[PDB]
Protein backbone atom coordinates (compact mmCIF):
# COMPACT_ATOMS: atom_id res chain seq x y z
CA UNK A 1 0.00 0.00 0.00
CA UNK A 2 1.87 3.04 -1.36
CA UNK A 3 -0.38 6.02 -2.25
CA UNK A 4 0.94 8.04 0.73
CA UNK A 5 4.48 7.97 -0.83
CA UNK A 6 3.57 10.23 -3.79
CA UNK A 7 3.47 14.03 -3.80
CA UNK A 8 -0.23 14.82 -4.26
CA UNK A 9 -1.67 17.73 -6.20
CA UNK A 10 -5.49 17.98 -6.03
CA UNK A 11 -7.88 18.96 -8.85
CA UNK A 12 -4.97 18.56 -11.34
CA UNK A 13 -4.02 16.50 -14.35
CA UNK A 14 -1.30 16.81 -16.98
CA UNK A 15 -1.69 17.27 -20.74
CA UNK A 16 0.91 16.36 -23.42
CA UNK A 17 2.15 19.28 -25.54
CA UNK A 18 4.49 16.96 -27.53
CA UNK A 19 2.22 14.24 -28.98
CA UNK A 20 5.08 11.68 -28.97
CA UNK A 21 5.02 11.13 -25.17
CA UNK A 22 3.53 7.84 -23.86
CA UNK A 23 0.43 7.49 -21.65
CA UNK A 24 -1.29 4.38 -20.34
CA UNK A 25 -4.87 4.48 -19.08
CA UNK A 26 -7.04 1.87 -17.40
CA UNK A 27 -10.45 1.85 -15.78
CA UNK A 28 -9.94 1.09 -12.08
CA UNK A 29 -11.86 1.23 -8.76
CA UNK A 30 -9.61 3.30 -6.46
CA UNK A 31 -6.58 5.66 -6.56
CA UNK A 32 -4.45 3.21 -4.53
CA UNK A 33 -4.68 0.78 -7.45
CA UNK A 34 -3.02 3.44 -9.64
CA UNK A 35 -0.41 3.89 -6.88
CA UNK A 36 0.30 0.17 -6.52
CA UNK A 37 0.86 -0.24 -10.27
CA UNK A 38 3.10 2.82 -10.45
CA UNK A 39 5.30 1.78 -7.47
CA UNK A 40 5.60 -1.71 -8.89
CA UNK A 41 5.73 -0.51 -12.51
CA UNK A 42 4.00 -3.71 -13.69
CA UNK A 43 2.73 -3.82 -17.27
CA UNK A 44 3.86 -0.28 -18.00
CA UNK A 45 5.89 0.20 -21.22
CA UNK A 46 7.91 3.00 -19.50
CA UNK A 47 9.22 4.23 -16.12
CA UNK A 48 6.20 5.50 -14.15
CA UNK A 49 7.03 9.02 -12.80
CA UNK A 50 3.52 10.14 -11.95
CA UNK A 51 -0.10 9.13 -12.30
CA UNK A 52 -3.56 10.73 -12.34
CA UNK A 53 -6.72 9.26 -10.90
CA UNK A 54 -9.84 10.45 -12.60
CA UNK A 55 -12.72 10.30 -10.07
CA UNK A 56 -15.25 10.98 -12.90
CA UNK A 57 -14.12 8.47 -15.55
CA UNK A 58 -12.86 6.09 -12.83
CA UNK A 59 -9.43 5.67 -14.53
CA UNK A 60 -5.70 5.75 -13.82
CA UNK A 61 -3.46 7.55 -16.27
CA UNK A 62 0.23 6.60 -15.81
CA UNK A 63 2.88 8.92 -17.17
CA UNK A 64 6.61 8.61 -17.97
CA UNK A 65 6.86 12.31 -17.00
CA UNK A 66 5.75 14.78 -14.37
CA UNK A 67 4.54 18.34 -13.88
CA UNK A 68 8.11 19.61 -14.27
CA UNK A 69 8.78 17.73 -17.57
CA UNK A 70 9.22 19.80 -20.75
CA UNK A 71 6.28 19.63 -23.20
CA UNK A 72 3.69 19.00 -20.48
CA UNK A 73 1.22 21.44 -19.00
CA UNK A 74 -1.05 21.29 -15.95
CA UNK A 75 -4.82 21.23 -16.50
CA UNK A 76 -7.40 21.98 -13.79
CA UNK A 77 -10.28 19.55 -13.26
CA UNK A 78 -12.39 18.75 -10.19
CA UNK A 79 -12.36 15.10 -11.11
CA UNK A 80 -8.54 14.74 -11.19
CA UNK A 81 -5.90 14.10 -8.55
CA UNK A 82 -2.20 14.10 -9.54
CA UNK A 83 0.44 11.99 -7.83
CA UNK A 84 4.13 12.45 -8.58
CA UNK A 85 6.76 9.80 -7.67
CA UNK A 86 9.35 11.36 -5.34
CA UNK A 87 12.20 9.56 -7.11
CA UNK A 88 11.58 11.93 -10.01
CA UNK A 89 11.23 15.12 -7.97
CA UNK A 90 14.75 16.60 -7.69
CA UNK A 91 15.64 16.15 -4.01
CA UNK A 92 18.60 18.54 -3.97
CA UNK A 93 18.82 22.30 -4.38
CA UNK A 94 20.20 24.43 -7.19
CA UNK A 95 21.66 27.73 -5.86
CA UNK A 96 19.31 29.32 -3.26
CA UNK A 97 16.71 26.70 -4.14
CA UNK A 98 14.00 28.96 -5.60
CA UNK A 99 12.89 26.08 -7.80
CA UNK A 100 12.85 23.52 -4.97
CA UNK A 101 9.69 21.33 -5.33
CA UNK A 102 10.59 18.43 -3.05
CA UNK A 103 8.66 17.26 -0.01
CA UNK A 104 11.06 17.86 2.95
CA UNK A 105 8.84 19.37 5.67
CA UNK A 106 11.10 19.50 8.68
CA UNK A 107 13.51 22.25 9.76
CA UNK A 108 17.25 21.92 10.51
CA UNK A 109 16.69 21.39 14.26
CA UNK A 110 13.96 18.83 13.62
CA UNK A 111 10.78 20.88 13.93
CA UNK A 112 7.81 19.89 11.78
CA UNK A 113 6.91 22.80 9.50
CA UNK A 114 3.66 24.76 9.82
CA UNK A 115 1.39 24.62 6.72
CA UNK A 116 1.61 27.67 4.42
CA UNK A 117 -2.23 27.79 4.48
CA UNK A 118 -2.23 28.16 8.30
CA UNK A 119 -1.74 31.06 10.72
CA UNK A 120 -1.12 28.69 13.62
CA UNK A 121 1.12 29.00 15.47
CA UNK A 122 2.63 31.79 13.38
CA UNK A 123 0.80 34.55 11.52
CA UNK A 124 2.38 35.49 8.19
CA UNK A 125 1.82 36.88 4.67
CA UNK A 126 3.19 33.99 2.56
CA UNK A 127 -0.25 32.89 1.37
CA UNK A 128 0.00 30.36 -1.51
CA UNK A 129 -2.31 32.61 -3.59
CA UNK A 130 0.14 35.56 -3.53
CA UNK A 131 2.94 33.18 -4.54
CA UNK A 132 1.78 31.13 -7.53
CA UNK A 133 4.65 29.23 -9.10
CA UNK A 134 6.37 28.92 -5.71
CA UNK A 135 4.47 25.66 -4.75
CA UNK A 136 3.64 26.76 -1.18
CA UNK A 137 1.68 23.57 -0.67
CA UNK A 138 1.15 21.61 2.49
CA UNK A 139 4.03 22.38 4.86
CA UNK A 140 6.97 21.99 2.47
CA UNK A 141 10.27 23.80 3.01
CA UNK A 142 10.36 26.53 0.35
CA UNK A 143 12.34 29.63 -0.52
CA UNK A 144 9.55 31.62 -2.27
CA UNK A 145 11.53 34.89 -2.32
CA UNK A 146 14.86 33.33 -3.45
CA UNK A 147 16.68 34.45 -0.37
CA UNK A 148 20.15 33.69 0.90
CA UNK A 149 19.56 30.87 3.34
CA UNK A 150 17.81 28.40 1.04
CA UNK A 151 14.43 26.68 1.63
CA UNK A 152 12.78 27.36 5.02
CA UNK A 153 9.38 27.17 6.74
CA UNK A 154 7.27 28.66 9.50
CA UNK A 155 7.66 26.26 12.39
CA UNK A 156 4.96 24.40 14.41
CA UNK A 157 6.85 25.30 17.63
CA UNK A 158 5.19 28.50 18.86
CA UNK A 159 8.64 29.49 20.20
CA UNK A 160 10.39 29.25 16.81
CA UNK A 161 8.70 31.42 14.23
CA UNK A 162 10.74 30.06 11.26
CA UNK A 163 13.88 28.06 10.51
CA UNK A 164 15.89 26.94 7.48
CA UNK A 165 15.54 23.37 6.30
CA UNK A 166 18.72 21.38 5.73
CA UNK A 167 18.48 20.45 2.03
CA UNK A 168 21.69 19.43 0.22
CA UNK A 169 23.10 21.38 -2.73
CA UNK A 170 22.92 19.20 -5.91
CA UNK A 171 26.50 19.98 -6.92
CA UNK A 172 29.11 21.84 -4.89
CA UNK A 173 32.80 21.02 -5.25
CA UNK B 1 8.29 2.55 6.98
CA UNK B 2 11.66 0.74 6.52
CA UNK B 3 11.00 0.62 2.74
CA UNK B 4 11.67 4.38 2.56
CA UNK B 5 15.36 3.70 3.22
CA UNK B 6 18.20 2.28 1.22
CA UNK B 7 20.03 -0.36 3.30
CA UNK B 8 23.81 -0.90 3.25
CA UNK B 9 24.58 -4.15 5.09
CA UNK B 10 27.57 -4.44 7.48
CA UNK B 11 28.04 -0.72 7.36
CA UNK B 12 28.09 2.07 9.87
CA UNK B 13 29.01 5.77 9.91
CA UNK B 14 31.49 7.68 12.14
CA UNK B 15 31.68 11.45 12.66
CA UNK B 16 35.08 13.03 11.99
CA UNK B 17 33.36 16.34 12.80
CA UNK B 18 32.49 15.87 16.51
CA UNK B 19 30.07 18.86 16.45
CA UNK B 20 27.44 16.91 14.43
CA UNK B 21 24.50 15.66 16.48
CA UNK B 22 23.77 11.99 17.15
CA UNK B 23 21.00 10.22 19.13
CA UNK B 24 20.94 6.62 20.26
CA UNK B 25 18.44 4.33 21.90
CA UNK B 26 18.02 0.65 22.70
CA UNK B 27 15.07 -0.63 20.71
CA UNK B 28 13.88 -4.08 19.57
CA UNK B 29 13.94 -4.06 15.76
CA UNK B 30 15.38 -1.98 12.87
CA UNK B 31 11.74 -1.25 11.98
CA UNK B 32 11.44 0.77 15.18
CA UNK B 33 14.46 2.94 14.27
CA UNK B 34 12.92 3.61 10.82
CA UNK B 35 9.62 4.63 12.41
CA UNK B 36 11.25 7.17 14.71
CA UNK B 37 13.39 8.47 11.80
CA UNK B 38 10.49 8.90 9.31
CA UNK B 39 8.29 10.57 11.98
CA UNK B 40 11.37 12.52 13.17
CA UNK B 41 9.74 12.82 16.58
CA UNK B 42 11.95 13.79 19.50
CA UNK B 43 15.03 14.17 17.34
CA UNK B 44 16.74 17.57 17.68
CA UNK B 45 17.78 17.48 14.00
CA UNK B 46 16.53 16.38 10.59
CA UNK B 47 16.96 12.55 10.40
CA UNK B 48 18.68 11.49 7.16
CA UNK B 49 19.95 8.03 8.10
CA UNK B 50 20.23 5.65 11.01
CA UNK B 51 22.28 2.61 11.90
CA UNK B 52 20.79 -0.41 13.68
CA UNK B 53 23.40 -2.12 15.87
CA UNK B 54 21.95 -5.65 15.70
CA UNK B 55 24.17 -6.77 18.62
CA UNK B 56 23.16 -4.16 21.21
CA UNK B 57 19.70 -3.72 19.55
CA UNK B 58 20.39 0.03 19.43
CA UNK B 59 19.40 2.75 16.94
CA UNK B 60 21.78 5.51 16.10
CA UNK B 61 19.89 8.35 14.30
CA UNK B 62 21.93 10.90 12.26
CA UNK B 63 21.47 14.26 10.55
CA UNK B 64 23.93 12.97 7.86
CA UNK B 65 24.38 10.04 5.49
CA UNK B 66 27.37 8.42 3.68
CA UNK B 67 27.66 11.38 1.23
CA UNK B 68 27.93 14.01 3.99
CA UNK B 69 31.13 15.78 5.00
CA UNK B 70 32.35 15.34 8.54
CA UNK B 71 31.55 11.61 8.29
CA UNK B 72 33.17 8.34 7.27
CA UNK B 73 31.74 4.95 6.24
CA UNK B 74 33.00 1.75 7.93
CA UNK B 75 32.60 -2.05 7.74
CA UNK B 76 31.25 -3.86 10.83
CA UNK B 77 29.25 -7.09 10.83
CA UNK B 78 26.73 -6.07 13.57
CA UNK B 79 25.64 -2.92 11.76
CA UNK B 80 23.14 -2.06 9.06
CA UNK B 81 22.99 1.37 7.58
CA UNK B 82 19.66 2.75 6.36
CA UNK B 83 19.67 5.95 4.34
CA UNK B 84 16.49 8.02 3.85
CA UNK B 85 15.89 8.28 0.07
CA UNK B 86 15.06 11.99 0.29
CA UNK B 87 18.69 12.74 0.98
CA UNK B 88 20.25 10.52 -1.66
CA UNK B 89 20.68 12.56 -4.80
CA UNK B 90 17.97 11.43 -7.19
CA UNK B 91 19.23 13.22 -10.33
CA UNK B 92 22.46 12.53 -12.21
CA UNK B 93 25.36 14.72 -13.27
CA UNK B 94 26.22 13.78 -16.86
CA UNK B 95 27.18 10.13 -17.18
CA UNK B 96 26.12 9.61 -13.56
CA UNK B 97 29.33 7.89 -12.39
CA UNK B 98 28.34 8.62 -8.81
CA UNK B 99 24.65 7.70 -8.87
CA UNK B 100 23.70 5.85 -5.63
CA UNK B 101 19.90 6.11 -5.68
CA UNK B 102 17.37 3.25 -5.63
CA UNK B 103 15.73 3.30 -9.10
CA UNK B 104 15.53 -0.37 -10.22
CA UNK B 105 13.28 -0.15 -13.29
CA UNK B 106 14.58 0.37 -16.83
CA UNK B 107 13.53 2.95 -19.42
CA UNK B 108 11.00 0.51 -20.92
CA UNK B 109 9.58 -0.43 -17.52
CA UNK B 110 11.37 -3.69 -16.73
CA UNK B 111 12.29 -4.75 -13.19
CA UNK B 112 16.10 -4.98 -12.99
CA UNK B 113 17.86 -8.29 -12.36
CA UNK B 114 19.89 -8.16 -9.12
CA UNK B 115 23.65 -7.73 -9.67
CA UNK B 116 24.06 -10.84 -7.47
CA UNK B 117 21.79 -13.07 -9.59
CA UNK B 118 22.81 -14.90 -12.78
CA UNK B 119 19.20 -15.53 -13.93
CA UNK B 120 18.24 -14.78 -16.57
CA UNK B 121 21.60 -13.22 -17.42
CA UNK B 122 25.14 -14.33 -16.70
CA UNK B 123 27.70 -11.54 -16.44
CA UNK B 124 31.02 -10.27 -15.02
CA UNK B 125 29.75 -7.39 -12.82
CA UNK B 126 29.86 -9.06 -9.40
CA UNK B 127 29.94 -6.56 -6.50
CA UNK B 128 33.42 -7.75 -5.40
CA UNK B 129 35.46 -6.43 -8.37
CA UNK B 130 33.62 -3.09 -8.50
CA UNK B 131 34.27 -1.94 -4.97
CA UNK B 132 32.73 1.43 -4.09
CA UNK B 133 30.29 1.26 -7.04
CA UNK B 134 27.35 0.11 -4.85
CA UNK B 135 26.27 -2.83 -7.05
CA UNK B 136 23.69 -4.00 -4.52
CA UNK B 137 20.15 -5.39 -4.91
CA UNK B 138 18.88 -4.49 -8.43
CA UNK B 139 19.64 -0.73 -8.51
CA UNK B 140 20.41 1.10 -11.74
CA UNK B 141 24.15 1.74 -11.72
CA UNK B 142 26.97 3.06 -13.93
CA UNK B 143 29.97 1.14 -12.40
CA UNK B 144 32.41 1.83 -15.20
CA UNK B 145 31.29 5.47 -15.36
CA UNK B 146 30.58 5.13 -19.08
CA UNK B 147 28.62 7.03 -21.74
CA UNK B 148 24.92 6.14 -21.51
CA UNK B 149 24.42 6.61 -17.77
CA UNK B 150 23.10 4.20 -15.16
CA UNK B 151 21.75 0.78 -16.27
CA UNK B 152 20.97 -2.78 -15.14
CA UNK B 153 20.54 -6.35 -16.35
CA UNK B 154 16.88 -6.99 -16.95
CA UNK B 155 14.48 -9.51 -15.36
CA UNK B 156 13.17 -10.09 -18.90
CA UNK B 157 15.13 -12.98 -20.62
CA UNK B 158 14.35 -11.34 -23.97
CA UNK B 159 16.16 -8.22 -22.76
CA UNK B 160 19.66 -8.72 -21.35
CA UNK B 161 20.16 -5.11 -20.16
CA UNK B 162 18.69 -1.60 -20.56
CA UNK B 163 19.56 1.96 -19.46
CA UNK B 164 17.55 3.54 -16.70
CA UNK B 165 15.64 6.75 -17.21
CA UNK B 166 17.16 8.95 -14.44
CA UNK B 167 16.81 12.70 -15.05
CA UNK B 168 19.85 15.00 -15.29
CA UNK B 169 20.17 17.46 -12.40
CA UNK B 170 20.16 20.17 -15.12
CA UNK B 171 16.91 18.98 -16.70
CA UNK B 172 14.59 21.15 -14.60
CA UNK B 173 14.60 24.91 -13.71
Swiss-Prot record, chain B:
Residues 1-86 form the PAN domain. Residues 91-169 form the Kringle domain. Disulfide bonds join 33-59, 37-47, 91-169, 112-152, 140-164. This is Hepatocyte growth factor alpha chain. It comes from Homo sapiens (Human). The lineage of its organism: Eukaryota, Metazoa, Chordata, Craniata, Vertebrata. The gene is HGF.
Amino acid sequence: NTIHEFKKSAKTTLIKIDPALKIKTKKVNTADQCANRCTRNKGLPFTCKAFVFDKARKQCLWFPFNSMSSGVKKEFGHEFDLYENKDYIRNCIIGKGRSYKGTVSITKSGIKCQPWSSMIPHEHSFLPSSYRGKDLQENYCRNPRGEEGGPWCFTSNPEVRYEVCDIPQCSEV
